Motif scaffolding. Structure first.
Motif, PDB file in Angstrom:
ATOM      1  N   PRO A  65       3.843   0.499   6.824  1.00 35.37           N
ATOM      2  CA  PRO A  65       3.551  -0.109   8.126  1.00 35.37           C
ATOM      3  C   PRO A  65       3.458  -1.641   8.042  1.00 35.37           C
ATOM      4  O   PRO A  65       3.073  -2.205   7.014  1.00 35.37           O
ATOM      5  N   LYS A  66       3.776  -2.317   9.156  1.00 33.42           N
ATOM      6  CA  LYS A  66       3.683  -3.784   9.315  1.00 33.42           C
ATOM      7  C   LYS A  66       2.248  -4.310   9.467  1.00 33.42           C
ATOM      8  O   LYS A  66       1.949  -5.432   9.061  1.00 33.42           O
ATOM      9  N   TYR A 107      -4.709  -7.098  -1.839  1.00 34.98           N
ATOM     10  CA  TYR A 107      -3.315  -6.746  -1.526  1.00 34.98           C
ATOM     11  C   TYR A 107      -3.056  -6.797  -0.024  1.00 34.98           C
ATOM     12  O   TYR A 107      -3.997  -6.770   0.773  1.00 34.98           O
ATOM     13  N   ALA A 108      -1.781  -6.889   0.365  1.00 38.01           N
ATOM     14  CA  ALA A 108      -1.402  -7.112   1.754  1.00 38.01           C
ATOM     15  C   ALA A 108      -1.807  -5.928   2.655  1.00 38.01           C
ATOM     16  O   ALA A 108      -2.632  -6.087   3.560  1.00 38.01           O
ATOM     17  N   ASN A 109      -1.258  -4.739   2.359  1.00 32.43           N
ATOM     18  CA  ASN A 109      -1.631  -3.447   2.947  1.00 32.43           C
ATOM     19  C   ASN A 109      -1.901  -2.413   1.838  1.00 32.43           C
ATOM     20  O   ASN A 109      -1.439  -2.559   0.702  1.00 32.43           O
ATOM     21  N   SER A 110      -2.585  -1.320   2.179  1.00 32.78           N
ATOM     22  CA  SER A 110      -2.885  -0.203   1.269  1.00 32.78           C
ATOM     23  C   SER A 110      -1.635   0.531   0.759  1.00 32.78           C
ATOM     24  O   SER A 110      -1.527   0.849  -0.425  1.00 32.78           O
ATOM     25  N   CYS A 111      -0.655   0.752   1.639  1.00 38.56           N
ATOM     26  CA  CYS A 111       0.636   1.378   1.331  1.00 38.56           C
ATOM     27  C   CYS A 111       1.408   0.622   0.240  1.00 38.56           C
ATOM     28  O   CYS A 111       1.874   1.213  -0.734  1.00 38.56           O
ATOM     29  N   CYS A 149      -3.221   8.376   4.121  1.00 39.44           N
ATOM     30  CA  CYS A 149      -2.160   7.377   3.935  1.00 39.44           C
ATOM     31  C   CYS A 149      -0.986   7.587   4.924  1.00 39.44           C
ATOM     32  O   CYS A 149      -0.826   8.691   5.457  1.00 39.44           O
ATOM     33  N   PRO A 150      -0.134   6.565   5.168  1.00 41.04           N
ATOM     34  CA  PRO A 150       1.016   6.677   6.076  1.00 41.04           C
ATOM     35  C   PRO A 150       2.191   7.492   5.500  1.00 41.04           C
ATOM     36  O   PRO A 150       3.086   7.897   6.245  1.00 41.04           O
ATOM     37  N   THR A 151       2.200   7.753   4.187  1.00 42.80           N
ATOM     38  CA  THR A 151       3.210   8.541   3.458  1.00 42.80           C
ATOM     39  C   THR A 151       3.286   9.986   3.975  1.00 42.80           C
ATOM     40  O   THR A 151       2.337  10.757   3.814  1.00 42.80           O
TER      41      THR A 151
END
Length: 44
Positions: free
Chosen positions: A7-8, A21-25, A40-42
Motif C-alpha cells: 500500500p501507498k 521503516y516507511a510502511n510495515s509491508c 497484513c495487506p498480503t
C-alpha cells in the motif's frame, strides 16, 4: 520477476530490530518482521 504490491499509505513503525521503516509491508518484503504477521495487506 515478482514485486511487492504494498500500500501507498504511510505506516512508520518501530520495527523489530529497533529501526524505522516507511510502511510495515515494505519491512516484510525487505526481510524483517514486526510480530504483526496475523494482520497484513498480503492476500494472494
Amino acid at each position: 520477476k515478482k514485486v511487492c504490491a504494498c500500500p501507498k499509505i504511510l505506516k512508520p513503525v518501530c520495527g523489530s530490530d529497533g529501526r524505522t521503516y516507511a510502511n510495515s509491508c515494505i519491512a516484510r518484503c525487505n526481510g524483517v518482521s514486526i510480530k504483526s504477521e496475523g494482520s497484513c495487506p498480503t492476500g494472494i
